[PDB]
Design a protein around this ligand. Sequence first.
Ligand SMILES: *[C@@H]1O[C@H](CO)[C@@H](O[C@@H]2O[C@H](CO)[C@@H](O[C@@H]3O[C@H](CO)[C@@H](O)[C@H](O[C@H]4O[C@H](CO)[C@@H](O)[C@H](O)[C@@H]4O)[C@@H]3O)[C@H](O)[C@H]2NC(C)=O)[C@H](O)[C@H]1NC(C)=O
Ligand SMILES: *[C@@H]1O[C@H](CO)[C@@H](O[C@@H]2O[C@H](CO)[C@@H](O[C@@H]3O[C@H](CO)[C@@H](O)[C@H](O[C@H]4O[C@H](CO)[C@@H](O)[C@H](O)[C@@H]4O)[C@@H]3O)[C@H](O)[C@H]2NC(C)=O)[C@H](O)[C@H]1NC(C)=O
Ligand SMILES: *[C@@H]1O[C@H](CO)[C@@H](O[C@@H]2O[C@H](CO)[C@@H](O[C@@H]3O[C@H](CO)[C@@H](O)[C@H](O[C@H]4O[C@H](CO)[C@@H](O)[C@H](O)[C@@H]4O)[C@@H]3O)[C@H](O)[C@H]2NC(C)=O)[C@H](O)[C@H]1NC(C)=O
Ligand SMILES: *[C@@H]1O[C@H](CO)[C@@H](O[C@@H]2O[C@H](CO)[C@@H](O[C@@H]3O[C@H](CO)[C@@H](O)[C@H](O[C@H]4O[C@H](CO)[C@@H](O)[C@H](O)[C@@H]4O)[C@@H]3O)[C@H](O)[C@H]2NC(C)=O)[C@H](O)[C@H]1NC(C)=O
Ligand SMILES: *[C@@H]1O[C@H](CO)[C@@H](O[C@@H]2O[C@H](CO)[C@@H](O)[C@H](O)[C@H]2NC(C)=O)[C@H](O)[C@H]1NC(C)=O
Ligand SMILES: CN1[C@@H](CC(=O)c2ccccc2)CCC[C@H]1C[C@H](O)c1ccccc1
Ligand SMILES: CN1[C@@H](CC(=O)c2ccccc2)CCC[C@H]1C[C@H](O)c1ccccc1
Ligand SMILES: CN1[C@@H](CC(=O)c2ccccc2)CCC[C@H]1C[C@H](O)c1ccccc1
Ligand SMILES: CN1[C@@H](CC(=O)c2ccccc2)CCC[C@H]1C[C@H](O)c1ccccc1
Ligand SMILES: CN1[C@@H](CC(=O)c2ccccc2)CCC[C@H]1C[C@H](O)c1ccccc1
Lengths: 213, 213, 212, 213, 213
Amino acid sequence: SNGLMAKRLRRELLNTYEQLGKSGLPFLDDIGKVDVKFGLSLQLLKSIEQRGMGFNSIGTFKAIVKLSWVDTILRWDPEPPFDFQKIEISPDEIWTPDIKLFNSVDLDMTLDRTTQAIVFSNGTVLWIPPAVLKVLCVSQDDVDSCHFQFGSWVYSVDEVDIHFMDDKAEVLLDFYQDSLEILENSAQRQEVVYPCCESAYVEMKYLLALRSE
Amino acid sequence: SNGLMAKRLRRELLNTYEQLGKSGLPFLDDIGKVDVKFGLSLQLLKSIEQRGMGFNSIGTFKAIVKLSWVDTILRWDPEPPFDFQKIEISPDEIWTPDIKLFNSVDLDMTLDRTTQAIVFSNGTVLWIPPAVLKVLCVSQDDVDSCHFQFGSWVYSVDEVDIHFMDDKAEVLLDFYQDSLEILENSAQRQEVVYPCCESAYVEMKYLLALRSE
Amino acid sequence: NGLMAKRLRRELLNTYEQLGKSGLPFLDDIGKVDVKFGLSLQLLKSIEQRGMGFNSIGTFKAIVKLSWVDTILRWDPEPPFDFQKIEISPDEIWTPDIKLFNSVDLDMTLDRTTQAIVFSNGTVLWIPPAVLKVLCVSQDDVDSCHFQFGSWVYSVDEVDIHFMDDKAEVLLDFYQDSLEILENSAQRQEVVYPCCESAYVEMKYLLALRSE
Amino acid sequence: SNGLMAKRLRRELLNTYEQLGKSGLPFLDDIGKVDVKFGLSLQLLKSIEQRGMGFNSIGTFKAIVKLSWVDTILRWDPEPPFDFQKIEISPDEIWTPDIKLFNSVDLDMTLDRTTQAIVFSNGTVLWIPPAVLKVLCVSQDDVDSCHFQFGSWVYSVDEVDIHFMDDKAEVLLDFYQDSLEILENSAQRQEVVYPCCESAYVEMKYLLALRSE
Amino acid sequence: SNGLMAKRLRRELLNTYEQLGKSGLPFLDDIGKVDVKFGLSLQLLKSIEQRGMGFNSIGTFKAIVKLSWVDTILRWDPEPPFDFQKIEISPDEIWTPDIKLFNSVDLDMTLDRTTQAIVFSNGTVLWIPPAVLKVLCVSQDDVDSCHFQFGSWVYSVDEVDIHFMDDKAEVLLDFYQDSLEILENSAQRQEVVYPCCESAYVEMKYLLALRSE
Ligand SMILES: *[C@@H]1O[C@H](CO)[C@@H](O[C@@H]2O[C@H](CO)[C@@H](O[C@@H]3O[C@H](CO)[C@@H](O)[C@H](O[C@H]4O[C@H](CO)[C@@H](O)[C@H](O)[C@@H]4O)[C@@H]3O)[C@H](O)[C@H]2NC(C)=O)[C@H](O)[C@H]1NC(C)=O
Ligand SMILES: *[C@@H]1O[C@H](CO)[C@@H](O[C@@H]2O[C@H](CO)[C@@H](O[C@@H]3O[C@H](CO)[C@@H](O)[C@H](O[C@H]4O[C@H](CO)[C@@H](O)[C@H](O)[C@@H]4O)[C@@H]3O)[C@H](O)[C@H]2NC(C)=O)[C@H](O)[C@H]1NC(C)=O
Ligand SMILES: *[C@@H]1O[C@H](CO)[C@@H](O[C@@H]2O[C@H](CO)[C@@H](O[C@@H]3O[C@H](CO)[C@@H](O)[C@H](O[C@H]4O[C@H](CO)[C@@H](O)[C@H](O)[C@@H]4O)[C@@H]3O)[C@H](O)[C@H]2NC(C)=O)[C@H](O)[C@H]1NC(C)=O
Ligand SMILES: *[C@@H]1O[C@H](CO)[C@@H](O[C@@H]2O[C@H](CO)[C@@H](O[C@@H]3O[C@H](CO)[C@@H](O)[C@H](O[C@H]4O[C@H](CO)[C@@H](O)[C@H](O)[C@@H]4O)[C@@H]3O)[C@H](O)[C@H]2NC(C)=O)[C@H](O)[C@H]1NC(C)=O
Ligand SMILES: *[C@@H]1O[C@H](CO)[C@@H](O[C@@H]2O[C@H](CO)[C@@H](O)[C@H](O)[C@H]2NC(C)=O)[C@H](O)[C@H]1NC(C)=O
Ligand SMILES: CN1[C@@H](CC(=O)c2ccccc2)CCC[C@H]1C[C@H](O)c1ccccc1
Ligand SMILES: CN1[C@@H](CC(=O)c2ccccc2)CCC[C@H]1C[C@H](O)c1ccccc1
Ligand SMILES: CN1[C@@H](CC(=O)c2ccccc2)CCC[C@H]1C[C@H](O)c1ccccc1
Ligand SMILES: CN1[C@@H](CC(=O)c2ccccc2)CCC[C@H]1C[C@H](O)c1ccccc1
Ligand SMILES: CN1[C@@H](CC(=O)c2ccccc2)CCC[C@H]1C[C@H](O)c1ccccc1
């Protein structure tokens, strides 16, 4: 259709978020559970720097994080004059899951939020930003072992669920471009109880071990 | 019970802040005293780096800070159509305590202010952001000793009070993930008078000592 | 007239202010944008060995050249709007989401304060300074580095990319360094990614430098 | 007398700044001379790093800067319902002196501009932000000697004057927490003519010498 | 004569820029040529670091850049009640020359854009921001040789012209505070043709050589 109508479609969809704010689960009727599909694709190691004279180190990684979830506020009927299958939207203009790298040595991993998300007419959002992750590794016997723990900061399992995208319970290596040998690569979804709260939080925990250089 | 109603509730609660601004103690009626509950949870040590050739060092820590206080502006009756016991709100849309790390070697500790706070119907706010803390430690005889001093920057004890969350006067280790041995761990609340002002300011002072690597 | 120029800009940008900058730059039928892309190397900031292995982080200063057609920004160049071109800030218009895929950081950085020039026919030419950081191979006194550029979310049906002036190599028009260039080639390829059926256009540059 | 009236007071005072902007000397009526009271309190040294192999070094300091001046735009009569002796305001919502660290090795010192200023009913503003200062020091014979030159960037002495807070011509040690021996500590106010301008500029020049570690 | 009237004048001057935007040469009638006077004042060297094991180095400098030009939009008759001969204005609220350091090893030199410009009633603007400049130098034979190339990014000589301030074709030493011996100091204004464009661009090229430490 018209490129005009595509922009108008975006503005109409975003009007709700502009008027009501981006905070809160993406439901206007019965509040349901958001199931977020999550993938972590490793590209390369930036650095691994021993901490002091001990066996630990700070591992800084370049990755691409993949996230998808359904936002019912962003649905539209794909017929004229809005006969579009999808539209691109800035992630800072919509609700996004507050999934953080809990064990970051910094505040959190950093995502490139200038990267656009794509929303399909059925409300499915797919957002695949580049990411920098910094964690505390153990460096022993020429092996560097690092873990990554992801979960929603404030939403428990009855509010935000998380599952591995495409059921792939592993660091994805589709974009891997480094020379380092991968020695261990596994991941687990677990529901973990925190002191704050009655309901468990979903943790996606990845274990990655690389041969030291 | 509707998601729409939760979003409208938030907008109604935040209208006061939007109209009149976030600045000023969080009271509709006679300005009283905010009682902040404060907790510090150590996750890990990013780095400890000797300053020059002396016995001092810059210690950089990853922690989670727990903050709770009452905002009487954010109160509502949990009855239909606003039958919600709590809601999530961005901390940058409401008043938050100006609690700073006084002895930071930088301007202040940094908190992840993208982290959402939860507000309960009685106005209780609970906000638990990740934090990075950089302080000057003493590194002597296989021990690294660091202190952390927290307090409201501008509000005296008659305006903002602070007490240890759950009355635990210590660094909390519920999220501790590092391999360092903790040799000392204590904290104390004191009211301190400074040259600027007649009224005292509340200081939460934590002392932490770790076995060196 | 100066006033007419500012008003022309405001008229042209009114669409973007009202509808937003997102979405392919078409007002009528949505076609394909064809971005012309150029990379001009100015200098190496640093190349730092990673650990004790044969890789290094290479940090480069370059100038990126981008041109495309935005049909929303067209005007008839007749009085009082008798202007062949105007200057516009890149953050006021759509710009292609071309990223350095293999950056060791989130992305390359471009100086987005640099103004773009838009001609009356809607052609935008924007030539920002850039800093690029990639993982190189440093072995046998040769530092080998690659750069992969492409639209992040738009496939070849939406955003295509071709070398500016058909020159499939790092441009040396602004080269101001002492390092000897041992290899300098580039390729346009359409690559299929896991996410999507339609291929994505990758501009891949190979650069090798004599080590210092 | 209530929290709502305090915010309405703030909104009324700030209306002038919102409608007309923060630029310009802070006078409601005739433009007079601002007299800034200035204090510098050294907390600690973050680092001192030799430059090359010479006698100079980059000294990076954590300090607290104290600033007071009068803003006649922000005056009110403390009579009910605006019976407040003071209110807190963000420094980015009002005029603040453009006092910069002239000899910074970076663009300028950095101040924590999230810290609130306090404005009293007579228009006196007191703002005491933490600060990070980085200057070029001389490091010779076991002594590190550093200087700090502060002054308004664009306002001459007939527009913005500066004097030492409490008339103390020295680096204040009220907040000093470091283990370094202070060997020299002095300050002097002088009026200095720069080539740009007929009228002189007020320079607050502090000299600090510390024993090397 | 009064503080509120000075703000009203600024608001009226800036109205054009707020309504029409800051982009485009500062003319409302016939579009002419802007003549920028440019001065570079070296204060000190932050660092000079050898690149690898070769003969080049990264030189990081603190300077003050002096810029003057005429903005015919910001003119006014200095008569009551706008009897002000100059006003201070934020450089982010008016057109400024897009003069960049072409050979910066970073994206560009950085200027402190919080620093106010002063506009005189005849439209002459004078803006003198602190600056940090990072360039690639040659370090050989105990001499560090560095060059600085400045010019407007998008405007050719027909649109923006540049000349040395006070006719001095050299790095100005009016603010020089460093101990380094300056062995070479010269500068040249040249019209350089670029591949993009028919009209030439004005380059101000400075040559500076220092004795190594
Ligand atoms: C406003 O609403 C909020 C949320 O509903 C509410 O906060 C909650 O209060 C309960 C009960 O006071 C807290 O439960 C406590 O948790 C801690 C740690 O788990 C315990 O130490 C407490 O133990 C009790 O027994 C102690 C000794 O006998 C007593 O000294 C103490 O007072 C306790 O009764 C207790 O289990 C809970 O932590 C919060 N929950 C949250 C999420 O905030 C608050 O009470 C309401 N405020 C008002 C003013 O009504
Ligand atoms: C929108 O309008 C703009 C402005 O008019 C327009 O930009 C112009 O494009 C033309 C044509 O591409 C440019 O003219 C050419 O520049 C190239 C430089 O590489 C020359 O090679 C061309 O010379 C010819 O002869 C060459 C061999 O000797 C041939 O290889 C070539 O095919 C040419 O026939 C020719 O001079 C012109 O420089 C710009 N103008 C400006 C001001 O930048 C743009 O093309 C329009 N956009 C679209 C999509 O049409
Ligand atoms: C505008 O309002 C401000 C804020 O109220 C006001 O500044 C304050 O002035 C008071 C009174 O001068 C100051 O309070 C004094 O501080 C000194 C030093 O600490 C004390 O010595 C004083 O105590 C007494 O003893 C003195 C000597 O014996 C007596 O001379 C005096 O009368 C006292 O009995 C006293 O507490 C206060 O420090 C400042 N506060 C600030 C933040 O500036 C200012 O004066 C007002 N300006 C105008 C023009 O009215
Ligand atoms: C637009 O207005 C601005 C601001 O007023 C104006 O710039 C200023 O011009 C004045 C006066 O022309 C300059 O002041 C002079 O500077 C020089 C060198 O420092 C001195 O020689 C001058 O001293 C006097 O004595 C001279 C004989 O020795 C006389 O010939 C001379 O007239 C003087 O009486 C005098 O101090 C000043 O440098 C600038 N200031 C700035 C910030 O630019 C500008 O000229 C006006 N533009 C136009 C086109 O009218
Ligand atoms: C929402 O719509 C999208 C687009 O149709 C659905 O995703 C595509 O589904 C097809 C058929 O299974 C797959 O081959 C594609 O891989 C999907 N496209 C993309 C871009 O991923 C999506 O499944 C729908 N969501 C729901 C919840 O039904
Ligand atoms: C549990 N959550 C926070 C919860 C909160 O802020 C909160 C909860 C309830 C009310 C107010 C605030 C507290 C701090 C820890 C954090 C953990 C993260 O979920 C998480 C869970 C599982 C894997 C990775 C990350
Ligand atoms: C006391 N406070 C500031 C007070 C102020 O800005 C202020 C006060 C009154 C008026 C105007 C400004 C001045 C600088 C020190 C700071 C200290 C912090 O409170 C604090 C106290 C205890 C532990 C941690 C932090
Ligand atoms: C393929 N693209 C993203 C596509 C996407 O986000 C997306 C697509 C469809 C829906 C939602 C999101 C996924 C992550 C990889 C990225 C790669 C980049 O294009 C690219 C291609 C070629 C050279 C350089 C860069
Ligand atoms: C003098 N001032 C600037 C003045 C200006 O921008 C200016 C003035 C008038 C018109 C246009 C610009 C020029 C550059 C130096 C700077 C110095 C600072 O004041 C200062 C003075 C004393 C101690 C510390 C700092
Ligand atoms: C020439 N200029 C840019 C011109 C442009 O963006 C442009 C021009 C015309 C249309 C669209 C974009 C291209 C990249 C190089 C740059 C150089 C700078 O002028 C300059 C010249 C002399 C000294 C310092 C700086």
